[PDB]
Design a binder for this molecule. Structure first.
Ligand SMILES: C[C@H](C[C@@H](C[C@H](C[C@@H](C[C@@H](CCN1CCCC1=O)N1CCCC1=O)N1CCCC1=O)N1CCCC1=O)N1CCCC1=O)N1CCCC1=O
Ligand SMILES: O=C1NCCc2cccc(c2)OC/C=C\COc2cccc(c2)-c2nc1c(O)c(=O)[nH]2
Ligand SMILES: [Mn+2]
Ligand SMILES: [Mn+2]
Length: 181
């Protein structure tokens, strides 16, 4: 298969630490970034979005669950649950908001904004965990219209998503990413 050249953009566009974290996360599940480059980009973007989400809070407002070893990412959730008495989610979340004591599941969708929620709410029947979806076009959708974060932080988020979209369109690989889900 040799190289991919889209992974080159993925490496030149994202934080080196984010790239390494996404690479190790994909390799954990028997997937190759060198071939699944659209994946690679999707997991890198999800990682970055979760990171700006955690940064847009206060100081201890968010416990980051995504970007960890599966065993440790579960250990921290078990600790959170035995701490706050919150029922453990059936599926591993993304963040945990201490301020409002809820597991936030960050969704970075590619198709319609409604479809990602229609899938995520159906996946985790645990109605306690919160669900928040961002869009590449610049839209969003949260659970019970409770968007948790501010508005300028979320706006900076969607700005970053549209910047990544424009960068992908510059090198003419945008439809290849939109048609890979
Ligand atoms: C805690 C540590 C890493 C954190 C990830 C992340 C790093 C942070 C880097 C800072 C600088 N900023 C802020 C501005 C841009 C930047 O570059 N950001 C945030 C944006 C992207 C990024 O890189 N954040 C966010 C909260 C505090 C922190 O450090 N992670 C990784 C997963 C778990 C976790 O908490 N790690 C690395 C693994 C072991 C560990 O404990
Ligand atoms: O928590 C998560 N965990 C998934 C961890 C992972 C990383 C790499 C490879 C994997 C598993 O195995 C491959 C089979 C399918 C997965 O591929 C995609 C592709 C695009 C987005 C996501 C997953 C996505 N993952 C999560 C989210 O929370 C989320 O919003 N989106
Ligand atoms: Mn996740
Ligand atoms: Mn998620």
């Amino acid at each position: 298969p040799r190289g991919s050249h889209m992974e080159d953009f993925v490496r030149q566009c994202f934080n080196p630490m984010i790239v390494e974290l996404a690479e190790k996360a994909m390799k954990e599940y028997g997937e190759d970034p060198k071939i699944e480059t659209n994946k690679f980009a999707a997991i890198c973007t999800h990682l970055e979005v979760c990171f700006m989400y955690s940064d847009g809070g206060s100081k201890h407002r968010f416990e980051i669950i995504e970007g960890r070893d599966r065993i440790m990412a579960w250990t921290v959730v078990n600790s959170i649950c035995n701490t706050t008495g919150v029922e453990k989610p059936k599926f591993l979340p993304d963040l945990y908001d201490y301020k409002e004591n809820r597991f936030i599941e960050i969704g970075v969708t590619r198709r319609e904004v409604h479809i990602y929620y229609l899938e995520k709410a159906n996946k985790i029947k645990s109605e306690k965990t919160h669900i928040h979806i961002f869009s590449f076009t610049g839209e969003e959708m949260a659970t019970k219209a409770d968007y948790t974060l501010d508005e300028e932080s979320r706006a900076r988020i969607k700005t970053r998503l549209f910047t990544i979209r424009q960068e992908m369109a510059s090198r003419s690989l945008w439809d290849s990413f939109r048609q890979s889900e």
